[PDB]
């Protein structure tokens, strides 16, 4: 009599369904606390965090699998590539925003809360906010790469 | 051969399941498409298929013509 699997928000005529991986308290808590979902925070602020995390992470694959190392002294220079990819990406984001949102326009996110609490206007998703988000994404992206690289110079890690 | 043998209705139904996926994926549905994703049209398929068939045709024989000749002269 107890099923775990339920229609979304109690509405069976809408797309999604409710499952442990979608509406668990752990999943809900985790996703609500990512920088992306902090609706009430500065978009620029939210971005930098995403950049930092992402940047930092990208150095690994480039350096270890790069043509330049692989026993070739080039080493940590790869990280530099990663610094190049965050530039490409930034470009894409800037483009996505420019094209999507217009200057005058307002947000396109959804104002109703899941519970119907109409009380909430939200987000970046505006020409102004998105620019901020990408702009912060970049700064964070470059800084992420640099600090990972910085660690590379100091060394000590088992993989490289 | 893919564009020439498999036709449109199959791919249209496939894409609309992917349309569902994108909207229901967290962090990903922050980003929305400005152009609705659809399967290539019926004629467009035959054009795209023929171009591949032709490009392959021309590039394959050219690779053989030049190499077998110039390798021996």
């Amino acid at each position: 009599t107890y099923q775990v699997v339920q229609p979304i928000n109690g509405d069976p005529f809408i797309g999604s369904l409710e499952t442990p991986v979608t509406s668990s308290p752990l999943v809900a808590w985790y996703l609500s606390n990512l920088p992306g979902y902090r609706t009430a925070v500065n978009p620029l602020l939210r971005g930098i965090e995403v950049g930092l995390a992402h940047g930092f992470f990208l150095v690994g694959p480039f350096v270890k699998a790069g043509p330049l190392r692989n026993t070739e002294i080039a080493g940590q220079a790869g990280s530099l590539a990663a610094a190049g990819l965050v530039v490409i990406l930034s470009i894409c984001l800037t483009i996505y925003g420019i094209s999507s949102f217009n200057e005058g326009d307002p947000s396109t996110a959804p104002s109703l809360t899941l519970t119907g609490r109409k009380k909430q206007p939200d987000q970046l998703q505006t020409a102004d906010g998105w620019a901020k988000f990408t702009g912060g994404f970049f700064f964070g992206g470059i800084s992420g790469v640099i600090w990972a690289f910085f660690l590379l110079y100091v060394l000590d890690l088992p993989y490289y | 051969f893919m564009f020439l043998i498999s036709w449109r209705g199959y791919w249209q139904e496939l894409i609309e399941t992917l349309a569902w996926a994108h909207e229901r994926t967290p962090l990903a549905n922050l980003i929305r498409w400005r152009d609705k994703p659809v399967a290539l049209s019926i004629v467009q398929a035959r054009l795209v298929g023929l171009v591949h068939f032709s490009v392959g045709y021309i590039f394959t024989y050219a690779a053989f013509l030049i190499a077998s000749t110039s390798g021996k002269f």
């Binding site: 490409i88 470009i91 483009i95 420019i98 094209s99 | 400005r34 152009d35």
Partner: peptide
């Protein structure tokens, strides 16, 4: 070594071109 026009044609021109086309294409007058 002029052979450093390659990336420009090889990458820069394509990136600029793509970005521009993308913008023109998504424009809504």
């Amino acid at each position: 070594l002029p052979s450093l026009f390659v990336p420009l044609v090889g990458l820069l021109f394509p990136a600029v071109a793509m970005a521009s086309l993308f913008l023109h294409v998504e424009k809504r007058l």
